[PDB]
């Protein structure tokens, strides 16, 4: 049942489930670090939350080079 | 003799030839050391003197009490340790000149 649009929707609802994101303002070119103004602390929080929900081990250099929700979805489609 | 005093040191059976092949290995690995260092001179001096003491002994207790180092198998462990540092001092190049000096206002004590 694993389709890429379901991957994008599931990353979408777990980012909505994350509480500290203010406001929602979600897209594919969202770029939640500088367009939305959050710390790299929040970057590693989000990527380990992906790891906790449905991810692989997701090593920290690949975790650092994501920076974008559609690119998170595309990395999930890459490794799965 | 049988069951010397040290606990985890089980007794030997052939002291003479074992200690001789130990010191031939010492002189070999020391032969791979460079020449103008003092370390080759002092080690080769003391090891040739010790081996030359070993060369002419028919007995065991006479070699124990005559050659210093005391007990007979501690000499063998001591020889194995000196071979280990000879292998280690092929590396580390200690005969090179001094590594970079301290700020030189340091080793005076009374502050």
């Amino acid at each position: 049942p694993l389709t890429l649009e379901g991957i994008k929707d599931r990353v979408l609802y777990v980012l909505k489930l994350y509480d500290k994101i203010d406001p929602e303002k979600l897209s594919v070119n969202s770029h939640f670090m500088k367009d939305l103004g959050l710390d790299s602390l929040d970057q590693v929080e989000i990527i380990m939350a992906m790891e906790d929900e449905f991810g692989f081990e997701i090593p920290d250099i690949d975790a650092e080079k994501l920076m974008c929700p559609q690119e998170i979805v595309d990395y999930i489609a890459d490794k799965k | 003799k049988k069951t010397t005093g040290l606990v985890g040191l089980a007794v030997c059976e052939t002291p003479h030839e074992r200690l001789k092949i130990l010191y031939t290995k010492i002189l070999d690995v020391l032969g791979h050391i460079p020449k103008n260092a003092a370390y080759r001179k002092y080690t080769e001096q003391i090891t040739n003197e010790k081996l030359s003491i070993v060369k002419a002994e028919p007995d065991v207790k006479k070699l124990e009490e005559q050659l210093q180092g005391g007990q007979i198998e501690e000499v063998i462990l001591q020889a194995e340790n000196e071979l280990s540092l000879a292998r280690k001092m092929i590396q580390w190049k200690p005969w090179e000149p001094l590594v970079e000096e301290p700020p030189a206002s340091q080793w005076k004590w009374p502050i």
Binding site: - | T3, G5, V7, G8, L9, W109, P110
Partner: protein, 383 residues
């Protein structure tokens, strides 16, 4: 996985031990020690020499005069003072008395830590007489300072050596009765023979000192190799262990008690009537009659107790054969009236370092026997 027990500070000394054991026969034990941490080194750094002498009296607490002797010989070694001969002989006599005390407490507390109850009571009656001797000599029950750097302070009163002679005879009979009671006692031999073997190579690399070196082969006595005092004039021999057993180490402690009896006998028979303290008013305080009817003695008393004597700058490390082993003190002194930094080598600390190799292939009652079989007081292990 495996059972990670947490032995807390209850009594089986006082520690915490986390043992990742396999199945009644262990795997990986770790002593968390430091629960009795006091701050002795920082406190001695902010105090003077004479004032911080009781810290060296009580950092180890079962031995009470050998630690004083080690610190006082550190200061007398750095300060270039030979003590007078009668001070040296009284220091030797009380070193042997404290050695007898520490070995007999180690024997009795190891017996009670296994579970045998009665020779504890017997030999503590004997140690009650030991403390009566300490009371009559100094005035304290246990923590007699009494050993100034500059010799023995305030010599023993008239009528003591006869009591020490009576105590020598009766104590020889009582230690013979202890060997009568235990020692070929079958269940105790079954309790401790093959537990805690120590190779002499590991005894040198793990830095074991004193009784562990006697038990594991190699002959090593500070009293025989490096005579730091008049030990070269008294004749005694040290016991050596053949096998690395705990039973062997028990036999070694009992025979060190017996050799302490010999040294006490010869020290009573060869006492010289020299003098109490040194012939220098600038280090030892002058006596009270000369203090009152003398000007310079009052000035030296006043300055020697306010400022204290100064120490020339330098660093030294001395170590003496305390009953636990090489009790070491490393003084570093800027030229001043306070020491700059002192540090203590504890034989109990060095012995507790090798607890892994002493309890790798045995069970947990044997772990309690290993903790007991080394005279570890957990106040000296802290530094």
């Amino acid at each position: 996985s495996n059972l990670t027990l947490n032995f807390g500070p209850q009594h089986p000394g006082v520690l915490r031990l986390v043992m990742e054991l396999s199945g009644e026969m262990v795997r990986k034990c770790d002593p968390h020690i430091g629960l009795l941490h006091r701050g002795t080194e920082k406190l001695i750094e902010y105090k003077t020499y004479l004032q911080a002498l009781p810290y060296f009296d009580r950092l180890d607490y079962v031995s009470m005069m050998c630690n004083e002797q080690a610190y006082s010989l550190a200061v007398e070694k750095l300060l270039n003072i030979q003590p007078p001969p009668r001070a040296q002989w009284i220091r030797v006599l009380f070193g042997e008395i404290t050695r007898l005390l520490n070995h007999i407490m180690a024997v009795t507390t190891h017996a009670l830590d296994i579970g045998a109850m009665t020779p504890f009571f017997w030999m503590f009656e004997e140690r009650e007489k030991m403390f009566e001797f300490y009371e009559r000599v100094s005035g304290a029950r246990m923590h007699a300072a009494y050993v100034r750097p500059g010799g023995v302070h305030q010599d023993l009163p008239l009528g003591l050596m006869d009591d020490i002679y009576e105590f020598s005879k009766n104590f020889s009979l009582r230690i013979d009765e202890l060997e009568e009671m235990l020692t070929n006692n079958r269940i105790w031999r079954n309790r401790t023979v093959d537990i805690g073997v120590v190779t002499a190579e590991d005894a040198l690399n793990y830095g074991f000192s004193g009784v562990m070196l006697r038990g594991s082969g190699i002959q090593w006595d500070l009293r025989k190799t490096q005579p730091y005092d008049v030990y070269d004039q008294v004749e005694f021999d040290v016991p050596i262990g053949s096998r690395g057993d705990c039973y062997d180490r028990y036999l070694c402690r009992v025979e060190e008690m017996r050799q302490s009896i010999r040294i006490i006998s010869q020290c009573l028979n060869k006492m010289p009537p020299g003098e109490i303290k040194v012939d220098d008013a600038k280090v030892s305080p002058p006596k009270r009659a000369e203090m009152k009817t003398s000007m310079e003695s009052l000035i030296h008393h006043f300055k020697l107790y306010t400022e204290g004597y100064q120490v020339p700058p330098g660093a030294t490390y001395t170590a003496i054969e305390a009953p636990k082993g090489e009790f070491g003190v490393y003084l570093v002194s800027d030229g001043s009236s306070r020491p700059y930094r002192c540090k203590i080598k504890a034989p109990g600390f060095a012995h507790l370092a090798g607890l892994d190799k002493m309890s790798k292939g045995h069970m947990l009652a044997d772990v309690v026997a290993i903790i007991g079989t080394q005279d570890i007081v957990f106040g000296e292990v802290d530094r």
